Design a protein around this ligand. Structure first.
Ligand SMILES: OC[C@H]1O[C@@H](O[C@H]2[C@H](O)[C@@H](O)[C@H](O[C@H]3[C@H](O)[C@@H](O)[C@H](O[C@H]4[C@H](O)[C@@H](O)[C@H](O)O[C@@H]4CO)O[C@@H]3CO)O[C@@H]2CO)[C@H](O)[C@@H](O)[C@@H]1O
Ligand SMILES: *[C@@H]1O[C@H](CO)[C@@H](O)[C@H](O)[C@H]1NC(C)=O
Ligand SMILES: OC[C@H]1O[C@@H](O)[C@H](O)[C@@H](O)[C@@H]1O
Length: 361
């Protein structure tokens, strides 16, 4: 079917614009950086439904604004970009982004109701083309972290709820992309076949919903789409950038009946190599910059578009060792500190991304 990024304009949401203008710009002293910051507020990054309260507030508000714009004659029409991110026992292999719901406290029923309400809302807004990224990190943890107690404990629930979401959100105007980790996680030659088996089986078990378009890679990470030599921290993985990963991964998925198209996050991929000391250091990484802007013109048959899924400037996790959600990755030498709770605005990190932007603002 169709590439959902073709023939539309991507709406830049007002939540991210509001962070930049109300929190970042007033604290930025230099004129050029203020002007740069205003420009990055217009880059259309995904809007995250990270908490249940966002469904009837922020989601409805964004879809309503788009409808008004399109009903006025926007050309091309705008499309929404939304992330579904509220699994019970969320972020199973880390502490920083633990969610509001727990499997031991009716999390499965809370999640099904959240999905059902999202579905009702998307049905009401069927006139708005909606692109969704389904639960970043969830299935990638199923592949490599079955040795982690929280992840093995949540495995059967993650599989059931993913299938539930793929079926309930399989709507005419919706395109879904399942999160598929990244080059440095599932792109390792040892992990790529097992990842292809898992994604292709979930797709099959969901009844191969027509709205599932493929997979999203590099969400909330910093990998290059394509570099000319391997960054030192990538060795010895031969799939050292997303282009290598996706070129190796698509054949294995298509072999198992899932001919997935991809979308690749590049919101924090502008500077390479990054300042990461190890490829697994994912929290508030130093030496990173805003990367390639969202576009359907990728020059690749398997890639629907480059996107900005993780909104740069929104924290990856607190550096406070007394916090409930403290994760040691956020206290590393290559993690920017001090840092606020995951998802809260981190001005010093936003300025790092601005200064290191490529292309520049
Ligand atoms: O991306 C944001 C997300 O990150 C999650 O943490 C991830 C890291 O992003 C990811 O890079 C890390 O990847 C591991 C992978 O699981 C291992 O299988 C792989 O193992 C390699 C090993 O490094 C080699 O030495 C050895 O020779 O081969 C094996 C493969 O056979 O190592 C990579 C690291 O390079 O996985 C993390 C999860 O455990 C965070 O949890 C999450 O919160 C973030 O949102
Ligand atoms: C989730 O939000 C919906 C409204 O969108 C609300 O009706 C429901 O009670 C919330 N769920 C929980 C578990 O609080
Ligand atoms: O910034 C986008 C998302 O990043 C995640 O790491 C946080 O846990 C969420 O609260 C946030 O919505």
């Amino acid at each position: 079917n169709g590439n959902p990024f073709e023939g539309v304009q991507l709406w830049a949401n007002n939540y991210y614009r509001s962070e930049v203008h109300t929190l970042a710009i007033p604290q930025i002293t230099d004129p050029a950086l203020r002007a740069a910051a205003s420009a990055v507020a217009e880059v259309p990054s995904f809007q995250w439904l990270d908490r249940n309260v966002t469904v009837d507030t922020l989601l409805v508000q964004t879809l309503s604004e788009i409808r008004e714009a399109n009903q006025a004659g926007a050309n091309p029409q705008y499309a929404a970009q939304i992330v579904v991110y509220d699994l019970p026992d969320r972020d199973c292999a880390a502490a920083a982004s633990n969610g509001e719901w727990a499997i031991a406290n009716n999390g499965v029923n809370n999640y099904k109701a959240y999905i059902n309400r999202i579905r009702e809302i998307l049905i009401s807004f069927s006139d708005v083309r909606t692109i969704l990224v389904i639960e970043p990190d969830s299935l990638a943890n199923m592949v490599t972290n079955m040795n982690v107690p929280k992840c093995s404990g949540a495995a059967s629930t993650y599989r059931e709820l993913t299938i539930y979401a793929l079926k309930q959100l399989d709507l005419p105007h919706v395109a879904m992309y399942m999160d598929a980790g990244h080059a440095g996680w599932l792109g390792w030659p040892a992990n790529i076949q097992p990842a292809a088996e898992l994604f292709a089986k979930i797709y099959e078990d969901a009844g191969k919903p027509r709205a599932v378009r493929g997979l999203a890679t590099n969400v909330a990470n910093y990998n290059a789409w394509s570099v000319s030599s391997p960054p030192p921290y990538t060795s010895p993985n031969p799939n050292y950038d997303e282009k290598h990963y996706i070129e190796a991964f698509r054949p294995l998925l298509e072999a198992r009946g899932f001919p997935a198209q991809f979308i690749v996050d590049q919101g924090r991929s502008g500077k390479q190599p990054t300042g990461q000391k190890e490829w697994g250091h994912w929290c508030n990484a130093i030496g990173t910059g805003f990367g390639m802007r969202p576009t359907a013109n990728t020059g690749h048959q398997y890639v629907d578009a480059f996107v900005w899924v993780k909104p740069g400037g929104e924290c990856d996790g607190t550096s406070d060792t007394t916090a409930a959600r403290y994760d040691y990755h956020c206290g590393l030498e290559d993690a920017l500190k001090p840092a606020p709770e995951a998802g809260q605005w981190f001005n010093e990190y936003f300025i790092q991304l601005l200064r290191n932007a490529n292309p520049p603002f």
